[PDB]
Design a protein around this nucleic acid. Structure first.
Length: 683
DNA sequence: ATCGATAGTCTCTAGACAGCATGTC
DNA sequence: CTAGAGACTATCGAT
């Protein structure tokens, strides 16, 4: 007994404490691979075995005295998978978590056996020369199939390549979904694999068309005439939970309100109607509360993260009979349900276009509650036209092959700078060797000298990289890389901010010009954005012609900045939302993005001498005018309580303490205490 | 010198990661 | 390309 048997027994004893309470992972062929120390690629329809299997590999690696870094594509998953690994703490394992949003202070992190983070975060931790990042022996990359994503793809390819180039003894384990070329991923990873299509709960896929649903169980079908609003009530009655995937927030909300009529006559939460209107109210939030009360609920990126968890939790508790969602919880958090309904195979992406088979297969895969249903259902609602595509290409078709997307100017540019800053390349030559270990190369055997030299020349002009004897980063480049922003973003900032100083909207708009920023949509009615931009024109870093074929992209930037302006000029949240035609989740998202960029704009601004943006970042973070900054730094003191106090003479921690009695009248007895309680600590 | 219906037309459309350092009403 | 709901408008007609 060296370490192999020990880990296996420990893993065994542990499986017993869980197998009694998540089911069973048959075939030790996989579990054998787990304790093989060799790189492994697990491909399985459900995340079921994938994670558990993955947990053992890290516990095993933990026991040998190594550290594993479990990488995820989403913040939520990082949490879910975090609170989940909180169990292996028993055996003396220290869990961790590091997002660009949240980080565990629970333990010294660099002393954890399992550090959970997000892909881009993991990449950033490297960029920012983390210390523990260099003591990671096992790298588990969950959702490795996202390698195909035009957005997330390249980062996974780069993350892995950098990691491997470092710890040549690093063990890479990638968990993936089913897909024709999974073995190609495995080959690229130099890893034994294990492909299965096993599901804890079998899944029958159907096709509703013209009042007729036809299931598909094995070789024989089962036709039946039913309407959509019934397919739900059937499953609602069995308290099985129904998932209805819609293509637009408008669709999601519409449906949820109708289905509520049905659910209403089955349950009444009313208690949840509260936890939804808690954080925010107004149009959307109201409509959502009125759905949750009647037992229904729509779910999209417009809801606040709070309203999000509320709905998810309640759906499991059975309080919420139906959840009508968009692409959000499609691949987000684990939400089981006996039934699942795709209302459409299309989606707007340029034009109404059918989603990838993968997308559908990935939606229907949530159909089937492990340990409650003897079978899971996934119905596709289609019309005369695509019925055949639905059945032949979707219900019985195979998922598209995972294709690399790293071969793009933007992505090459974005990552090359990083590779040059972190030391992996130092000549256009090594830079290519680096891209040779990519999942793009092992998929195309193509050379990238043309673009790579192009990309590098770009960075050369922008002054992020200099060629003295070999490729080397400038202070700006190292800063832009460490800041994890698009080099174009950093160039816009550096260029503009070294030639002029900006006001509020000026610097705000500067942020909305950047590629990294999210921009609001200008509509028929935002005629006031044009006039408003005209007026502010001398305060903007540039001003296009009405005739410019880019004027509309300009108004989009402006509308976004104007929204950010109203946010830091202390405007009401719902007023903001109703004004710019956006929802609370949207506002918080937009705002949160702007702060990250605002911070970068400012660090680039300081290095170049400009100081007209200082104070803006903190303002955006809190959504207040400058005078409230001292008050909002205080815990429990936001934009509303801050104004209430400031306007009453209380304008800082001291004034808050010396007048505790006035404070309590102004902001609340409860709060007031908590607030003061906090002052005293940091004091 | 009119409100009005029916039909052709226009508008609109999912999601969500990063810095930094800890908590809105 | 592989859409479909809802707001918007025009265009003809009966009074």
């Amino acid at each position: 007994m060296k370490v192999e048997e020990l880990a296996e027994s420990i893993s065994s004893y542990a499986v017993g404490i869980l197998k009694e309470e998540e089911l069973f992972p048959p075939q030790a062929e996989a579990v054998e691979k787990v304790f093989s120390g060799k790189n492994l690629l697990l491909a399985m329809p459900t995340a079921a075995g994938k994670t558990l299997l993955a947990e053992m590999a890290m516990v095993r690696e933990a026991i040998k005295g190594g550290k594993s870094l479990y990488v995820v594509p989403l913040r939520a998953l990082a949490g879910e998978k975090y609170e989940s690994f909180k169990k292996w703490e028993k055996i003396g394992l220290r869990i961790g978590i590091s997002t660009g949003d949240y980080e565990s202070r629970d333990e010294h992190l660099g002393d954890c056996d399992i550090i959970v983070t997000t892909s881009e975060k993991a990449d950033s931790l490297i960029r920012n020369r983390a210390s523990w990042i260099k003591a990671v022996s096992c790298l588990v990359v969950d959702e490795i199939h996202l390698l195909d994503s035009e957005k997330r793809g390249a980062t996974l390819e780069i993350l892995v390549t950098k990691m491997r180039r470092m710890n040549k003894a690093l063990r890479v384990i990638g968990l993936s979904a089913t897909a024709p070329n999974v073995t190609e991923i495995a080959e690229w990873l130099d890893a034994d694999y294990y492909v299965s299509d096993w599901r804890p709960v079998p899944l029958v896929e159907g096709v509703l068309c013209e009042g007729t649903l036809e299931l598909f169980d094995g070789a024989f079908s089962t036709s039946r005439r039913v309407k959509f609003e019934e397919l739900v009530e059937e499953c609602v009655a069995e308290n099985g939970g129904v998932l209805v995937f819609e293509s637009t927030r408008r669709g999601a909300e519409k449906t949820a309100v109708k289905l509520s009529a049905i659910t209403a006559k089955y349950v009444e939460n009313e208690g949840l109607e509260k936890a939804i209107l808690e954080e925010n109210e107004g149009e959307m939030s109201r409509k959502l509360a009125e759905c949750v009360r009647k037992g229904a609920a729509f779910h999209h990126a417009g809801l606040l993260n709070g309203q999000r968890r509320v709905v998810e939790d309640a759906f499991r508790r059975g309080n919420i009979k139906v959840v009508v969602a968009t692409p959000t919880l499609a691949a987000g958090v684990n939400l089981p349900a006996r039934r699942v309904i795709v209302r459409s195979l299309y989606r707007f992406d340029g034009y109404s276009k059918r989603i990838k088979v993968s997308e559908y297969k990935q939606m229907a895969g949530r159909a089937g509650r492990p340990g409650m249903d003897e079978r899971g259902e996934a119905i596709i609602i289609v019309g005369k036209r695509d019925r055949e595509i639905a059945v032949k290409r979707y219900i019985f078709g195979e998922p598209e092959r995972i294709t690399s997307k790293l071969g793009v100017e933007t992505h090459l540019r974005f990552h090359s700078l990083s590779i040059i800053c972190d030391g992996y390349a130092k000549t256009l030559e090594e830079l290519e060797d680096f891209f040779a270990d990519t999942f793009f190369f092992k998929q195309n055997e193509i050379s990238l000298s043309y673009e790579l030299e192009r990309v590098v020349r770009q960075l050369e002009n922008w002054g992020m990289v200099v060629e003295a004897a070999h490729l080397a980063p400038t202070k700006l480049g190292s800063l832009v890389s460490r800041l994890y922003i698009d080099p174009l973003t950093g160039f816009i900032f550096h260029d503009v901010l070294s030639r002029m100083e900006l006001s509020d909207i000026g610097a705000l708009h500067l942020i909305c010009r950047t590629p990294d920023m999210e921009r609001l949509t200008v509509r028929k009615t935002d005629s006031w954005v044009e006039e408003e931009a005209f007026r502010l024109r001398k305060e903007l870093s540039y001003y296009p012609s009405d005739f410019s074929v880019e004027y509309d992209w300009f108004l989009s930037e402006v509308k976004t900045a104007l929204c950010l302006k109203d946010w830091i000029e202390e405007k009401d949240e719902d007023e903001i939302c109703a004004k710019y035609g956006i929802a609370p989740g949207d506002l918080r998202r937009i705002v949160e993005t702007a702060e990250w960029l605002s911070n970068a704009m400012n660090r680039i601004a300081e290095e170049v001498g400009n100081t007209s943006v200082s104070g803006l970042t903190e303002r955006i973070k809190h959504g207040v005018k400058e005078e409230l900054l001292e008050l909002v730094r205080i815990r429990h003191i936001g934009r509303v309580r801050a104004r209430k106090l400031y306007n009453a003479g209380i304008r800082n921690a001291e004034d808050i303490v010396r007048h505790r009695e006035k404070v309590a009248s102004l902001i609340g007895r409860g709060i007031a205490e908590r607030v003061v309680e906090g002052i005293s600590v940091k004091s």
